[PDB]
Design a protein around this ligand. Sequence first.
Ligand SMILES: Cc1ncc(C[n+]2c([C-](O)CCC(=O)O)sc(CCOP(=O)(O)OP(=O)(O)O)c2C)c(N)n1
Ligand SMILES: Cc1ncc(C[n+]2c([C-](O)CCC(=O)O)sc(CCOP(=O)(O)OP(=O)(O)O)c2C)c(N)n1
Ligand SMILES: [Mg+2]
Ligand SMILES: [Mg+2]
Ligand SMILES: [Mg+2]
Lengths: 542, 551, 543
Amino acid sequence: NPSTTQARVVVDELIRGGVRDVVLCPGSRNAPLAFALQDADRSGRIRLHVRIDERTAGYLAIGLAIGAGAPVCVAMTSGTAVANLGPAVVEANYARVPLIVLSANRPYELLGTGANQTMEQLGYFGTQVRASISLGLAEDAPERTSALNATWRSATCRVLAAATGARTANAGPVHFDIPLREPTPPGRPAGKPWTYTPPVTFDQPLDIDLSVDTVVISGHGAGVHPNLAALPTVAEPTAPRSGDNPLHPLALPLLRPQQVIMLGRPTLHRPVSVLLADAEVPVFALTTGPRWPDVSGNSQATGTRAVTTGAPRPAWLDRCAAMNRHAIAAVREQLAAHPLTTGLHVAAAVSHALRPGDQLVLGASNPVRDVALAGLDTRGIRVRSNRGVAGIDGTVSTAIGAALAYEGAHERTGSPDSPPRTIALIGDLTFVHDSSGLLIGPTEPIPRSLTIVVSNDNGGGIFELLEQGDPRFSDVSSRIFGTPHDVDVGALCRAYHVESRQIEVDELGPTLDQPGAGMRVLEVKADRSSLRQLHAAIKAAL
Amino acid sequence: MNPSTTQARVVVDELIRGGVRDVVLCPGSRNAPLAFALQDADRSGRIRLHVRIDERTAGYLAIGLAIGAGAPVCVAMTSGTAVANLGPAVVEANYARVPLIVLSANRPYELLGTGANQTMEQLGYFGTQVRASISLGLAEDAPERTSALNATWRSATCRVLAAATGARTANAGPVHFDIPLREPLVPDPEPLGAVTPPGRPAGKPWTYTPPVTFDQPLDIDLSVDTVVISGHGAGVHPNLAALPTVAEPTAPRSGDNPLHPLALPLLRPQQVIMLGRPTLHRPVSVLLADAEVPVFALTTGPRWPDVSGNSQATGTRAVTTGAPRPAWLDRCAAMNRHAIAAVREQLAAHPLTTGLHVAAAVSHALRPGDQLVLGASNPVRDVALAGLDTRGIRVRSNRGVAGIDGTVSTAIGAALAYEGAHERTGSPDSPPRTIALIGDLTFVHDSSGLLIGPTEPIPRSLTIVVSNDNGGGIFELLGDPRFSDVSSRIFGTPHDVDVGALCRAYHVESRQIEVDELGPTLDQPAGMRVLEVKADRSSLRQLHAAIKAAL
Amino acid sequence: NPSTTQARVVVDELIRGGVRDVVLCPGSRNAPLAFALQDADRSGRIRLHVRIDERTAGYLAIGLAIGAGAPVCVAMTSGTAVANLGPAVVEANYARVPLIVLSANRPYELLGTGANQTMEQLGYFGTQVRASISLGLAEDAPERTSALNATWRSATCRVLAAATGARTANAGPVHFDIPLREAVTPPGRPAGKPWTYTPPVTFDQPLDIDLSVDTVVISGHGAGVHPNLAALPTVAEPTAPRSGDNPLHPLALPLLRPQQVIMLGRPTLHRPVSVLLADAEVPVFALTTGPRWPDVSGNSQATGTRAVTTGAPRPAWLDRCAAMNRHAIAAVREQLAAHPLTTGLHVAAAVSHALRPGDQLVLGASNPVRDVALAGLDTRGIRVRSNRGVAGIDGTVSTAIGAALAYEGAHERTGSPDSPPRTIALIGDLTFVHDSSGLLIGPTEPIPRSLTIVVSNDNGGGIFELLEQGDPRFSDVSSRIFGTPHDVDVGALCRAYHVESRQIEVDELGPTLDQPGAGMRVLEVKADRSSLRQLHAAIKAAL
Ligand SMILES: Cc1ncc(C[n+]2c([C-](O)CCC(=O)O)sc(CCOP(=O)(O)OP(=O)(O)O)c2C)c(N)n1
Ligand SMILES: Cc1ncc(C[n+]2c([C-](O)CCC(=O)O)sc(CCOP(=O)(O)OP(=O)(O)O)c2C)c(N)n1
Ligand SMILES: [Mg+2]
Ligand SMILES: [Mg+2]
Ligand SMILES: [Mg+2]
């Protein structure tokens, strides 16, 4: 059958392209490439992950992709797949995650006369994906086997290149259709991809004078810039650090920088937003890819690297370092003097328990910010967070997939050491949102060293710190923003046969130092009724 | 009053004037103007607010609130993936023709593509699944044209409601209503006591559009041997009431001459009248796939199903000439009695409680006035197999796409709307019962739909029966492709998820009982509860073979 | 050959669905259904129209549909076809024209890796079409011939149903794909009947309206006929069918104080109409068919499909309106007589005077369609066409040509032994230059027998003289960027395409229209726009 030959050629090319994991869901029909994928899974060339929940499957693919940087395929055939995959595909587009969405249209059947069990289509594919490629239906022609093998492998390498950003430096989701009718020609020698894409550079140098009082702000997707390593740097948790001179986010409003270098895409902290929008401050955007971040439109120039003249005034560096120490002190002490555990205490504890080579996975809301408020030093750490569109959905499967991909890479190094830990920190709403991600059949890969820390303040803590958190809304905000739920986390973990423990904040460190089952949830109860006061006390101690 | 608060209050007001009684809300900062406005309407009793955490299952809750009493229902959420999480419920609402209003907050459209946090292409995200995609203009600070802005906001809100209820189209469905909103997003400390721009006098909708009467008479001769097949969304046809009728559980009965689905392949209809959209029964599909028998499609709206290649004509109602042969009605009535007798006998002779036994017991417990919610895979198949008489009861099921998402939330939402509709009657009697029958995989999958926050409305009389055979009604009853497909390997091992632990996790009363206690337990109440009945799946294929042999 | 069987089944069902005309263009590959359509053309079962310009070809299809109300197919395979069809597809959506766009995708070929010279997609199909249906590849299964013939014919009826609004009362464009791999044909129903028959449908939404309140009727594009409203003063657009005989000149409207408005169809003309419809003190009742209702300001009180009336207009009100109508008809005619130069308004008044029952009238956007209304044309017994969906000045020549062909075809189908009725088109000069391509028709292709295109040529855009940018403080700037003079030799253009042409004066227009010429002719009448604004100022002052 030409369709089975074609499917094996594609799967083979996908494996040479660096795909190591494929996610699937049961549906109305067989998945695309199902048998060739099954053969490769059995042979150990790739690893399959199956889930019933199509939404959590999309996010499992994201995690499997950002854990070690590899392209990941997700393949489902059902009438709800496109709708359920939407959230993950949007995150993959905005965070530039190489996600390949496989489909298998049927050209011998009617479309548009009723509900389609294979693909029920929304409007986001047009706007979200880097490419939409459909292989031909496989012709029955042994005469043309060599020419078809070339066409198929060329097209597969185009899918892979579009998703990884190999030539565009703009990785993201790709829609790859392999049609079939209802009801192996080799690749390049020595395992090379059919169409090889050697390394590319996009170079856009900007002239910047460092003698001007400069602060670096690095956000999601920031590059590494050695020539900027000495400047005071307010770094989001997921930004790689270029140097060793951190500036705490809370210190920023008490300095007066005269220019800003912005790396990647900042999304955290109102003081950062305000500074980038200040008309009297030059802002230089250094980022990869086609677009640049600039909500205010205030930025002066954008490129990919800086060509620097001068150096920072010693008085400026020394003044930034003293506000940095005052902010660190203000947090440590007001946390010490607070009589109730909050998410900020939980984040502080997780940050101390971390060691080099760990992978940290951060939920949206307070956790990703609290870790920054606690001054976590991210050097030697891989920090992952779905900052593309900052959803609270799918964070459990993202952590699981990230642990799996990260352990898989460490395994392949052959090293005798135990698999490096993955530690997730997420809020209680975030955990309830994607609890279904906890359900993993015995037939499926399970992380060996994943700890999910759930900081549970029985609602949405971040909203205590916004305008709706003002006391004049006290009666009203509790229901429509606090959103309390009274979930028994321990029961939920028991229901899914997931090792679970409820501990106090000071036991968090010790518990995380002691290894446990491959996958486990550590719940720490927290309070959010006092959170706006705690943050007010930290500000006043600045 | 700042522009965001003013706009939000005008929109919420016009939605209430348009007949919206329930609103599902999920938390966020960008939708804060909507959340404040809705909670004010809740506090003064103009609507009933339901807050949820998970946008996805929250959309099926809204679906339940819409199908329970027949009213348009809004779900409101923040910008970004929160909106994308409504996709699954939008698809169901489209195919099941449910008046679901997705009311999303957005950033100003000019911020698209600037790197703004939690922003995405929202307008048109759903494509052709929605009846309409409507946007409001960003609210300007310009009091001189407050009354002009009031008119455009209420008109837009009236277009949303008309598209969703099908007031002009006769084709209800979901509508995307996107509202770009900018700071300030919370109500100002001052002015105190501002006045929201007024709607029409006497609470009338700003632009009033009455429900269309859509009519398409079609001639049909009843003397030709006729079977009626009615599926999801079918209408009632008194002049067809005497015909033998294979009716899906969700189809309203027009008459009293039932024909069991198993009997149909053993009869020889010479023509078919197809009511609504029948998807459920394999015997039905086989018959409709046969291009030789003439089929007439009677539907309540402009859509008609593609299940038959030989639909001769479409209509909304038949104009009947003649009457059926008494011998033909005799023949069908005899096969009906035979078909159900085979089922009840083989059921009684089977030594193990299967999901079919649970469905038979549930069907036997119901009385007129009950609402019954069925998970759209096997529970709806089994209840029909057991021969449930649906006269005088409301059967709800997500038969649009018959997916697995949101079945629990839909049961909860149907119960709340149905009880509410009966609070308004004024009867002082206890609220009607809502009984849901859900399989264990479906219940586990949407278990988080059980979650109702302490401050949120709880059904007064919903019982969720879980027929737990520890794995699907899947590889029993087959589906040659499925044994080959590697994704089926998750179905080879019983999942063993503890149902009682799940009900504990969402603080819902749950008991585990035997099928014989089911009838008495349901007559007995107590708010919301789950009854888990364990069940065998191993003998299930043996049971169906015995029924097939008995025919 | 399976696709040959499929293609013939589809063409046969399309024919049974009332398709009489199909528009094609040469392209990189063969049009969908090309050989089945040829066979039907040869046999006189359908009529093929070929054009090289894909854009004019779409507007020709629009004309072939609106000329007698039939569904029309357009079939092009080229790398530019979707882009060139866009304008007509948008017009088909907004004017609710039953336009079927045929395509033929190749499922054995790669998509998305490079330029696609079979169909290069834009973003508009997802927002403009009523349906997008793909037949699916034809396979080699002779036993399933009955089942496949049923499936194909069903899908084709579903396509036709979506395009004509047979069940939705919402006609519009549909995308119909028949994919391709690269003499007995299975029969449809007895007696030429469609495979899935759709009996007549009604959408009924009655509204209670009190006629004793001082009421005016404004009817626009797509207005329906309402007997119970025939006596009210009615400001009608040229394309709106008249219900009665109490016209109310649009220039009269600002001089009356109506206390409620019944609005029929979709109004697009006259700023006094827009002002009245937006007046918060005036209840507005929108009566229209289809899913949506017009309401720019949001001021409307209710919408439906018909009126249930109580009461009757006060006789004082009727005479006040009938007299204000007389005042305005007279102010226009007297200041037209008093005006020194020929303007487009003069040309319109002359064309109005020359029309008679049985004629089809095609109006360009811009001043022509307004001027006919200001000239007080009586449209009873006259079929008035204009592309008011989006009011483009593009494609009006091919629209008039297609309208004429379809209207003539309807008359020839009767046995009448008469010269076919006249189609008279009135368009401005920019509009004519925009779609001049539509004049080029090969000897092989159908040509209207009685089409006369009148071109009111004021060497630019007359309508902008009458707008705010036409005020004298912009005299230097506006000439170039709104007037856009071109100095085209209209007679030389028509001679290049072998089209009978005459430059004539306005009094000469009635006589020339009375005796026929070649089947297609262009009558150019030179007009002035320099004095246009003051002419309208004179008519305002006279009121
Ligand atoms: C699917 C979805 N639906 C809604 C939202 C809006 N939202 C957030 C956003 O405000 C967070 C934005 C950011 O930059 O992190 S943060 C949030 C509350 C999360 O509560 P939590 O998980 O208990 O964390 P907590 O520590 O209590 O802040 C909600 C509900 C969302 N982000 N995703
Ligand atoms: C393709 C296209 N491109 C531009 C426009 C804008 N436009 C118009 C519009 O303003 C008229 C709209 C209406 O309601 O009639 S009217 C117009 C001038 C038409 O000049 P004309 O054909 O010589 O007519 P004239 O009698 O001189 O007014 C132009 C350029 C358009 N309508 N279509
Ligand atoms: Mg929380
Ligand atoms: Mg089960
Ligand atoms: Mg002109």
